[PDB]
Ligand binder design. Sequence first.
Ligand SMILES: [Mg+2]
Ligand SMILES: [Mg+2]
Ligand SMILES: [Mg+2]
Ligand SMILES: [Mg+2]
Ligand SMILES: [Mg+2]
Ligand SMILES: [Mg+2]
Ligand SMILES: [Mg+2]
Ligand SMILES: [Mg+2]
Lengths: 201, 186, 105, 180, 146
Amino acid sequence: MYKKEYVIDCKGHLLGRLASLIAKELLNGQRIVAVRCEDINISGSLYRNKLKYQEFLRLRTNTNPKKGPLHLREPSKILWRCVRGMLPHKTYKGQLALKKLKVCVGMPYPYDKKKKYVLPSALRAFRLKKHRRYCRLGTLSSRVGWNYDTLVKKNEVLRKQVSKAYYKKKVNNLNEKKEIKTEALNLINPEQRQVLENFGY
Amino acid sequence: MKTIVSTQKVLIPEGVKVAINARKVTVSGKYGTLRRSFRHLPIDIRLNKLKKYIKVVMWFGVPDSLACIRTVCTHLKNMFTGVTKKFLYKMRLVHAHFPINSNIVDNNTRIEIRNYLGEKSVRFVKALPGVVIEKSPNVKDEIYVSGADIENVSLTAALIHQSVLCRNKDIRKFLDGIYVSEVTTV
Amino acid sequence: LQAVRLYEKGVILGYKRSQRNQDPNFTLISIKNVNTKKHAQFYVGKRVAYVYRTTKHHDGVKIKCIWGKVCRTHGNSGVIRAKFKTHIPPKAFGDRVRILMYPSN
Amino acid sequence: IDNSLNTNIHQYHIVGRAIPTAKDKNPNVYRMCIFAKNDTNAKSRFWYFMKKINKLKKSNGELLACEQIKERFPLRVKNYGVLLRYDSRTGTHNMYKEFRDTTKEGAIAQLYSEMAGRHRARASSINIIRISEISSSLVRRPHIKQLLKRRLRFPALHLPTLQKEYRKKFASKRPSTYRM
Amino acid sequence: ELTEEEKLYISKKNLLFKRFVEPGRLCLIEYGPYAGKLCFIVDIVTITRVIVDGAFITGVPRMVIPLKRLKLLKERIKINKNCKSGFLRKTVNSTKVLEEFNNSKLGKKMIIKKKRDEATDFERFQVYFAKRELKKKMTTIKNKKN
RNA sequence: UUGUUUUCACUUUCUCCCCGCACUAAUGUGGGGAAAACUGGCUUUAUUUCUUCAAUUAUUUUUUUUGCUGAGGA
RNA sequence: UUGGAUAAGGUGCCUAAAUAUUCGCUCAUGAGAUCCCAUAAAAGGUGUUGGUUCAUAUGAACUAGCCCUGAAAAUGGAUGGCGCUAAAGCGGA
Ligand SMILES: [Mg+2]
Ligand SMILES: [Mg+2]
Ligand SMILES: [Mg+2]
Ligand SMILES: [Mg+2]
Ligand SMILES: [Mg+2]
Ligand SMILES: [Mg+2]
Ligand SMILES: [Mg+2]
Ligand SMILES: [Mg+2]
């Protein structure tokens, strides 16, 4: 929490545990950018979560539904609203904190070339026994009328190809640098070579 | 309670090629290739190529989990049977007053049904991938559905039987329909 | 290159409180690399500086400080309670402070 | 040495009798062995059982010894068989159970946890009869037979348990549960 | 007997689960007061409890430990039925296993980190000076290559 | 109702033999039978910085780093 | 008024303090979440976990923990909210 901005990819995290760890970072003061929100997991069967969303959809202001609960079915807005329900968003400071979060589906330009981190205390692999049931947020949002699941995958394929080429070039550069390093050790005063040898550099 | 180890052994026949990597299985043989995955249940299976006998082993387990070992073993045995001897399902179409008119099109898929209880309409089913439909060479009212995969052929045979279910009459008296009569191999 | 650091970084959290009560005599501070109670006790006597900016000049300059001290830990995770000469304004709860190292041992 | 792994159960040896009177001046002497948290609780249970089984109330008795029996081979592994009696919501029952441990009270601690977990039985409704050591050829339960084969081996399949300091909340590569 | 064919064949089946629990496993300790030390399994009590003993070489006594506080390592010593501390010390001394762990990928990094943590001010500056010297040779060989 | 007194079980080994001849989850295994005292246990020394000398209680003596306060004026 | 240390209750976020440790149980196509306190029964289950008897290692009977059926109302709604299943649920340490 001592950085200008952190970037988190949410592929493989459970919704509640991730949303709880983001809210305290926001309250303490930290910008957060969350990407790949369509790959978030929840800890029930897909049908059991579709029923819960159907319960959410049928509560509305009787006299005028323009007001009242607004049902947002993109995956990124779902996490946005789940975090909003863990902040004191009706004061001033708690509204300031809510504005320091940005959410995306996919991985647009500025962040496709930045470093992404993960939160191990929210990863499904470490938190859910292997004989339990779970669903994916993209499938659920499609089942309630989102309509953009396919295009995101189509774009992710291209992004991954470009990243693969970049990684190839990076590995070549690293090997070329390792050779230059190993040559230059022979051309230094011996005592500097011992002091580098002793401390494992 | 928990049990430390439990194992079962399944032999490989003579004319079969096998491969297992991450609980993903492929088998090959005279009549084609079959693919199947098992990445939803905790097992580490061991394949001995020089000998036969894939082996399935499970560490600490409970009665509800231990019941899935024999299931996997039987699925493996069935797909071994599939590639050396295709599965066969025989079906008899039985009528009382109106004879049933069958018709196979499209390279031995897509059976067509006419005159079921004399109704002037046409009913279709279309076989699952890998399954071929044909009528018997010996007897009048037999259809053969067959080939290489027990699940696909048995479910095609089931799709045919439920094609001609009888509506709101007494079904202990109106017995017309198409029924599975024998299960064997080719 | 220039302007050496010679201090450890920190963020000022709220006051010492419960649910629904305030007690603004002490303030809670978080230290950058400290996340156990045993390690937080290492800093238990150091001097704290909170430096901020204004818009007018006050004595020829546009910067002023409020001095404080590290008094104790706050329980199991490396947070501390600090006592300042004047109470910290609540419009500062995400800002920076300098955990100095002057009173050396 | 590690106070996060200790249980608070010890064993005691208590001896008692009644105050001698003009009608009775060589009264019987009684002994018991009790598992408790401290010696005061053990004396409490001793007088409870004296009153219930014999006609001895504390206020006209007298205590003679409290000794706290210790364990002779605290690092060898034994097999233990326990006899119980506990009250359910709709009756009173009695059972036999078996444990594996290195100390008798190390097994009594397990027994209390198992009886809370499996049956929701509180410590106040449980009476313990006859802890004893049993040989390995007279074991009756299937989950003890598992552990006494010729050559015991198995892989370790737990998730890691790290120190609080290296439990960094915001990581740079997603870890693995395999660990071979 | 078994021919060479079967023989190497036994030595070619890389099993999924290596590193079993048994008398002689190494088990760097990960949680608790004795965290960051080495030890040995000498007996197993239940599924979850294990008796552990690092001989008088390491600073751990013979004691009981929950199994979830351990990390099994590659090295195992073939020790006997119900060994005690005295014979275990002799066996670990004669087999020379501790210092062949120190040559692995993880022992080297543990030792190097400990070395770095004990450095003084002058030693830190010496490391900085050596790196600054090395950078010049880097950047002159580079400019020669292109 | 207690103190003696007898009977038979209790140890595993990377050793040997027979049967299944590779059958195991295992760089081994299932059934049957032997050997030894390496390992484990017990005696007599003469020893404690190779190593250990613990834990709880009773009774005593110190120690590192630091927060807050300075009433009175004989 | 200034310091210190608690009670009753709490320690995933709202919200100051444990995503603490160490044992068991539970999967719910209407789970559950503790004085007062804000409802549920008789009768059933070849769900799963322990236990007690009678019968050459298979049958039968019985018993009690969590879960399920019995279980229908009027504006849109309430374990306080989010949510939570390697619990942030229930019984202990
Ligand atoms: Mg307010
Ligand atoms: Mg209020
Ligand atoms: Mg001899
Ligand atoms: Mg006060
Ligand atoms: Mg609670
Ligand atoms: Mg908090
Ligand atoms: Mg029955
Ligand atoms: Mg709570």
